[model samples]
Target chain A: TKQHAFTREDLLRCSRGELFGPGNAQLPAPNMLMIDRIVHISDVGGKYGKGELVAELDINPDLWFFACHFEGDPVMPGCLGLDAMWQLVGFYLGWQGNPGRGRALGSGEVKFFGQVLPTAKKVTYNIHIKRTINRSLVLAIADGTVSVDGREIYSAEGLRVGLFTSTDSF
Target chain B: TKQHAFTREDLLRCSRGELFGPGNAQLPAPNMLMIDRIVHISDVGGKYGKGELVAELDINPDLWFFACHFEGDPVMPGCLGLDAMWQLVGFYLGWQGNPGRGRALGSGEVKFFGQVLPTAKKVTYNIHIKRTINLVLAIADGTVSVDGREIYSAEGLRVGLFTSTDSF
Candidate 1:
């Protein structure tokens, strides 16, 4: 079967009041869940030859962050972009059928070559699965980029997420 | 001169509708601004011995992130805590009379050993000035903790917008 192209509803189902179902993880609410759609995903073919996922966040000019990140400055916070990467890796761990709630473990190094501004039309997330840990709690690591209008603005490595079995303290 | 200890009112004055002044860098507006108070700061005494700064964020379950970072998870977004570190470094550059708009230059490695949840009473940020890149640019290494557990550690944290006043 072709890998499912996740919709916002599916994203919501990733996590809610409780685990949406088995093998699912949690994500931010509508206000903070950055990815609006997962256009493509697969268990194979990416930089590491493990898996690849492509997602998009349609940026509306009036999104809440612009109102307060700074007064006259409305550049998207780099941390949020990094968090967006964290969110995707969390979803990928679940998409792999790993059972447990996901948590962001750590990041390698993050840099911002450009900024996502209010005028930007779309923020695209490109993730290439580099590694996975199934022996422990389900886990995955990926290297990714955040792009605006095809301009690669943010890049990160060693983005990590791990599923903690409900029995273990998170 | 002893450094100015930023208050909630002074924090507001950091950034409002416009640049606070010619040399002060802009901070996030109140809604997104993370640090509430800077109790102590100095250009001396820290891991690096160049400077030290301490700030606090009062946590309320009713705060914005708890409701949104995850509908079911009331944990504070690690990014916001990281952003709080960024916010403080921004304040520090301007606090030193550096002129220019502040931006998060970059970070070395960010690790989360624990988390901040709605049950959290207060969060503290401790920063040690790594060094000033130049006259106007500054870099620091820092850690954050909820209550007393040191949960977050950030390194190579740099800020301070480069201004024309920069000699080189």
Candidate 2:
């Protein structure tokens, strides 16, 4: 089923934590502040649903890697970008009640299109949950794009498998 | 042409920064210190010719992530593990005179077999350069393994493309 496209007002509403659930205000370290908000979520019914996730971060000039990645040139390491996608997907999984209280099952084949310069004040990520499966545990396939001023600079697709913790099984 | 398999002594020789070039004692930033040392590098004239490289690291508990990964259950984030592999490959490329002065493009399809726990003292990575093409730019496919006791195994494959800084 087709989900409704997001509008400016819709985005604001989601930011208010009404439709998509809460912002990741309490997510622990390494995961903290990764996804700023969930912009859109579509309930297509049954075992799985489709949604769009977003992450907005002001490039903290003082952030750790800036001094080292390159002597003069500084850019967000691609791995951290991948980490952002994982955090975004984690929130999406959480909204779904964490079917199996899943753990991430490493991403396969990530393609980075361009660099995110340290000077850029903001970077935005658009995450799409393309497919999902729920059995004894849960698995989801997601695609992501990172951009500034609507120019797509990076993109990737990843697989996340969640395990059913003992509590989740019952 | 055939390259001899390396002995512990041979590896130690390379580690002295003569054969494979110096350790990344100079690489800067988040990229620095990812792989503590290169334990082995395959011969340059085997059937594959400079197609294999290996590195090892002791999971330092005081590493930056341990403090923030998850209160006390600090485990090496898989992405960082992947990063370490990239760093290892970067060094390998550098030692090869940086054909094209190559910069990493990206990787494809990495599958992780198990977690590298914080308590695990040592983890070894074996990298095999399966294929290579060099022109203005260079592209290589690498297979990797993370293990200890030669029993516990974790594996992945990556495709790395590099371009001359001038052209790229």
Candidate 3:
């Protein structure tokens, strides 16, 4: 449900394929799949400064079994992407002061476009921000889309808030 | 929390500045508001077969609250516009049998780029198809923003599912 603050070791370990466990580890949990690729990060301005985050992951076919709807229509659940956004930002900030120090205020509004196919090449996440808040007030506007080869397939924008435990009270 | 479906007569009566009941004919319900213009309608394609609902309504400050948070900073309650979508579609399809088949499917996401001020401009609603499942499955991407401002002054999508009392 909740992920810990990201760390440099986590990114380093991820580059080397550590994949699991805790502390400085970046690999996803076994059985869990990453379906979207974050491709950019912007400068975090106001209070928290300015910056952006980007990465990508694949979708699992079995996802349909767990999120069953129609008899044969399998669409990636929107909430899943939302969860991914939270973690993506969480990792972007990296580990601050242990678990208690990292907390996201929550996304304001997020939109979904195009569809995440079982074989879609990679979902691209595009984020553009005008205002920034680190502790007291934080807001981010994020957009995501699915891409095949080099074309865009799906897109969405996520408004979010982040609170670093070291600098926040709530 | 809930709304009563307005009939053609209801719309007509309101247009004429008349109240619902005979005794109340001379008095207006504090909650009564008029919808003069319909700015947009669903394209009926894209994500779902029937298309999702989207539209704009005129806000009369005296008759509506348009309440929001964070003190001086305020935005229209996105839910109100969504609720309007549900009502508009329901009216178009009739109540489908429920005494008051009017309720929002719940909010998935919402945003307001500009403050929903009680001015001369009308509220704009953009809705896209997300998915659908017969009569039970319905979802749409939605946004509410004013003209002039680039990027959605306020933007978000909505997911909705409906139930009918019978095969209406």
Candidate 4:
């Protein structure tokens, strides 16, 4: 079997033209979040297999003021976390053409056990694939658990089915 | 350590009770167009401990009316599948309260692919524990493929974390 592999350096050069984030060479940075770091992509398996991608996010207060509050407890919206998972998977998929999107297969029995503190840094995403069809599955594990303090704040298993919809078209 | 060793009969009972449709204790009947069929449950290997239960569903014209005629395309909603998984697990956990008492959890990402067809009785589910807390992490795998065929139509991996806010 013949498989192609590119190093991080190669990806960076590819990004010079595409401006895509690390691992992804198809898209540009304009549509991607600035990924701070990479922990590993070897848990679920390897490149083609299931693996967890851990990254660091610089919490921006101005970016989202709606969820912020001077008084009372404010929490990060679930969508932001979802956005992170989407981009992470996109990075791993490394599709140059319009990557097919995933439709919400359905949520598992999820529980809101705790809240994510705004000051929380070092978000770890654990992705477990339920099944892969054309680079997509209906279910996966996506969590912002693992923190610097070694505390788990937010966690959920996302059920995302892969589709061929363009990320920019939406 | 003392644990419950279930006979085949006990598991059958638990699955029967989980039905939103009419089911019999013995020779359980399929209802709502017989949309879903019981898949195998892995033994001795879940969050609660060891032991698991699974079910598969196929999106077909017969099941589509119940699956998703209202929404379109005809796909099994994850919640419905999750409820089935919980009920199966409840069979092992022995649900003590009323039916449909609380909500399990919602998903931020749910992927859908390949349409479920009438003949495509291709749905599968697997429930096992990844972690245990006040809430147990039970992983579920659901797939929709060609009916009795080899090609996969659509599949979903559902991770369920459950807890009780109030004791009944």
Q: Over the stretch A23-129, how does candidate 4's per-residue lDDT look in tens digits?
A: 22231221123344444554345433565566555554443421322112233433344444544554444432323333333333233444345665545554444
Candidate 2 displacement at residue B56 in angstroms? 1.2
Q: Write the per-residue lDDT of candidate 3 for residues B97-141, one digit (tens) a residue.
A: 222222223334443333454553665555555554343433555
Which residue runs of candidate 3 sit more than 4 Å off their true CA positions? A1-49, A63-71, A95-104, A135-158, A164-170, B1-157, B160-168
What is the CAPRI rating of model 2's predicted complex? Answer: acceptable
Alpha-carbon deviation at A91 in model 4, angstroms: 2.4
lDDT of 4 by residue, B1-168 (tens): 122333434434433443221221111222211224444444455545655555455455664333322122233333334334433443333221222212123333343333333445465555553322233333333333344432221122223222432231
lDDT of 2 by residue, B43-79 (tens): 3542256566666666767777665553434556666
TM-score of candidate 1 relative to the true fold: 0.92
Candidate 4: regions farther than 4 A off: A1-35, A42-49, A60-72, A95-107, A135-148, A161-170, B1-168
| Residues B1-168 of candidate 1: C-alpha lDDT, one tens digit per residue | 254477877777777723348535877885678889888888878889888889999998998878877665578888888998888888777777667777776688888878888888999999999998774667888899888889888888877575631221
The Cα error of candidate 3 at residue A78, in Å, is: 1.9
TM-scores for all candidates?
0.92, 0.72, 0.38, 0.36
Question: What's the ranking of the predictions by TM-score, best on top?
Answer: 1, 2, 3, 4
Clashing pairs in 1: none
Worst 10 residues of 1 chain B by lDDT: B159-168
lDDT of 1 at A132: 90
RMSD of 2: 7.2
Error of 3 at A36 (Å): 7.6
lDDT per residue (tens digit) for residues A1-170 in model 3: 13322343444444333423233213232222242334444354422354545555545565442233112233444444444454455444432222322233434544443346455545444344434445543333444343434555344345453433232131
Interface RMSD of each: 3.0, 6.5, 16.9, 16.5
